[PDB]
C-alpha cells in the first residue's frame, strides 16, 4: 500500500507519540496543582506553547490551545461577532469577507450567521486565471461594518496558496484611514491548516491577527491552537466557552496534557526541519507529475493544481485523467496500491471546490487528489503510477 | 507519597493507555475516509460509542463525543438558548434553574447569560439541613419561560449526591400540564462528572434529557461526551460548532481517535467493575473518617461531607480539624505524604452553610481505586505530625 492522502490526515511522528505516551504515564496531574504529577503537566504545557510560537515566529503569550481546527476557526468568527455586539451595546450586523474555497469550518459558520441574520458575508470568488482571490476584490468588498477578512493560507483540495501577506498589508493601510474616519479596524485571519510543516509559516511575514493551527496536518495529534496577535493587549478575543480559568479564560477546561505534549513536539519538528520537509515533498510531487505525463501523455493529464505563476503546496497534485469512464472515485476503487481521495475526506458528484476554481465539469468529474508526505519516495510514486495505469486499462475494456 | 485528590483528576488505567497508544500507531487514518488506518479508526469510534452508552444504560445513538466536560456543559446551555430563539423567530428570554454549588462550567456560562441579558437564571440554594437543593424549591422556581433544569449529580467538593431522579420525575409530570397549557416542556440536565465510576449512573433511573460525561474523572483521557435522550428525534440539540459533518453535525471536527479509544476503554472498565470500585472506595473513605476521629478526637473533627440522611460519593471526605492555626492550605503545606486539596475559604462550602471558622480549616480528601487502608494510616499520621508542628 502507498498513502498519498496527507492533506486529509498525517500519521504521528514516532517522537510525537513518545511525547504523548510519556505524558500519559508521568504528567497526569491537574496542571493547576503543586504536586509532581501536576507540576510536570504545567511544564509540558508551557514548553509546548513556546514550541508552537517558535514554529510560526510568534510569542507564546499569543497562543491558546484548542480542541482542533474546527474550534479554532469557529472561535475567531464567534469572537468577531461578540466584539461587534459589545461595541454596539454601548440593527447593524458585522460583515465578513472570505473566499469561495474555504474549509467547511470557515464556510459553514459564516453561512449559518447569514441564515440567522446575525452577520453579512461576502464570499469572494477565486480567479479562474490565478486560482487566488484577488486582493483588489477583497478590498472592493469592504463595508463600514466589515470586521474580519478570513482567507485560507493554502487550499486543501488544490494546494493553491493565497496572497495573505498582500491582503494583510493592504488591510493595515486601509485601517489607518478607517480609524481616522471613525470606522473600526478590520482584522485578518488565515486558516493555515494545510501550510504548516509544508512551507515556512511566519506571522510577521503574513501580517495576520489570527492564525489557525491544526495538529493532524503536520504529524501531530488531533488537537489544535489559535494564534492571536498580542492577545488581550492588541487583539480582543471573546471566548465561546465558560468555566475554570484555563488558557487565561479564553479557552477554559482542564488541559489535555498528552495532546498538548504531542502538539508541542510536532511543532518542534516543523521548526527544526520545515525546509527539508518542503524540499522532499516538492521533489516527489514534481516527480509524480512528470511520471503521470510520461505514462499517460501530456494531452491526457489535467494538472488542476497548476495555475500559471501561482504558488502551491509542495506536496499536492490534484489532477484528472481524460476519459469518459475515468471518474475519480471509480479510478480509485480499481487501484490496489494507491490510497488517495477525490477531495476533502469529510465530503467522501464533482467537488464544489474544484468547480469554484472554474475547473470544467468534465475535468472536475475525473479529478483525483494525491498529496504526498515526509516518507513518500520516488519508488512509491512509480508503484502508484503503474497502479493507476492498470486501473485505467481495466475501466477502458 | 499518597494521592487523595481523585475528584480533581485520576491517573489513566493501564488498559486505557494501551487502547490509546494502539490507536495512535494503528488507527491514525481519517475516520471519514475509506481504507485501512481509517476503517480501523471509524471502528474504534463506533465501539467506544457503544461502551459509553453501556456505562450509562443508554444507546449509542444518544452519545456524542466532546473535548471535555466544559464543552459538554456549555453545549447544553447554548443549545437551550438557541432553541428558544428558534421558537420565538416564528423580548422574552429563556429561564434556567440550577443550584448554588455547580462547577464553574455550569455556573459561569449561566452568569454570563444573566450579565449579557440573554437569559434569566435561578440559582437555587442548598438546604443547610440535607445539603441538597430541595426539589420543592426547584419546582417553585419554574416560570413560563423556564427551559432547562441543570443540577449536578454529585458535588465535587463535598461528594453530596443530588436528588436528580426525583427532579426529573417531578419535571416530567409538570411538563404534561405545561404542554396542555401551551407552555413548552422543561428539559433536565445533570453534570455527572463526579459520579461516574463511583456509583451506578443509569439514564433511565435518572430520567434526564442531557448528561455530561468527563473522562478524566474515571481514569480516562481528558475528553468528554454528552448524552442526549433520543438525540434528534426527542431532545433537540443545536450545535455550537459548524464544520465537516462529524458527530452527525452536532459536533463537527476530525475525530480524536486515540482520545475516543481511551474514553471507550475507561467506560468499559466502569461497566465491568463499578460495584467493586464503589465498595472499595467506601471501605477506605469510611476507614479514613474512623481513623481521623480516633486520632484527633470526635469533637475535634467536623465532617463537612456528612449530612444525616443524605447520600454522598463513596470516596469523598471533606473535613476540618478545629484549631486557630489549622487553615486547610497551611495543614497541607506541612504534610509530607498526603496529596490533596482544599477545593479564602471555599465559596462552595460557604454555600453549603458551613460556618466560616470550620470552612477555612476544610481539607478535601477523595480516595480512588488503588488507595489502601495502609495508605490511610500513613496519611492520618502525616496529618497528626502536621497539626502538631503548627501547634508548635
Ligand atoms: C471535573 C468536572 C467537570 C469538567 O471540567 P473539565 O475541566 O472540562 O474536565 C465538570 N463538572 C464537574 C462537577 C467536574 O468535577
Ligand atoms: C484539515 C483542515 C482543518 C481542520 O479541521 P479539523 O477537522 O477540525 O481537523 C481546517 N481547515 C482546513 C483548510 C483543513 O484542511
Residue numbers in the entry:
A (entry chain A): 31 to 120, 133 to 390, 395 to 443
B (entry chain B): 31 to 120, 133 to 385, 395 to 443
Paper text:
Moreover, in a second crystal form (P1) of hSCL, crystallized at a higher pH of 8.1 and soaked with 10 mM Cys for 2 hours, the electron density of subunit A showed the formation of an adduct, most likely a C388-persulfide, to C388 in the closed conformation. The persulfide adduct was present in subunit A with near full occupancy and also in subunit D, but there at lower occupancy. The formation of a C388-persulfide after 2 hr incubation with 10 mM Cys is also an important clue to the chemical basis for the inherent Sec specificity of the enzyme because it indicates that hSCL is not, at least under these crystallization conditions, absolutely specific for Sec but may perform Cys desulfurization with extensive concentrations of Cys over very long time scales. However, this should have no biological relevance since the reaction rate is insignificant in activity assays. The inherent dynamic property of this segment was also confirmed by the structure in the P1 crystal form where, similar to structures of other Group-I enzymes, it was disordered to different degrees in all four monomers of the asymmetric unit. Residues A 391–394, B 386–394, C 389–393 and D 391–394 are missing from the electron density in this crystal. It appears that the dynamics of this particular protein segment is a common feature among group-I NifS-like proteins. Interestingly, in group-I enzymes, this cysteine (C388 hSCL numbering) appears universally located in a dynamic segment, shown to be able to adopt at least two ordered states in hSCL (this work). In addition, a disordered state was observed in the P1 crystal of hSCL, as previously described also for other group I enzymes.
Interestingly, human SCL (hSCL) is unlike several bacterial orthologues specific for Sec and does not accept the sulfur analogue Cys as substrate with any appreciable activity. SCL and CD enzymes are NifS-like proteins that contain a completely conserved active site Cys residue (C388, hSCL numbering) that form an enzyme-bound persulfide (Cys-S-SH) or sulfoselenide (Cys-S-Se−) as product of the reactions with Cys or Sec, respectively. Similar to the non-specific SCL/CD enzymes, hSCL was found to adopt the canonical fold type I structure of PLP enzymes, forming two active sites in the homodimer interface with each monomer contributing residues to both active sites. Structures of hSCL in two different crystal forms were determined: P1 to 1.8 Å, with four monomers per asymmetric unit and P212121 to 2.1 Å resolution, with two monomers per asymmetric unit.
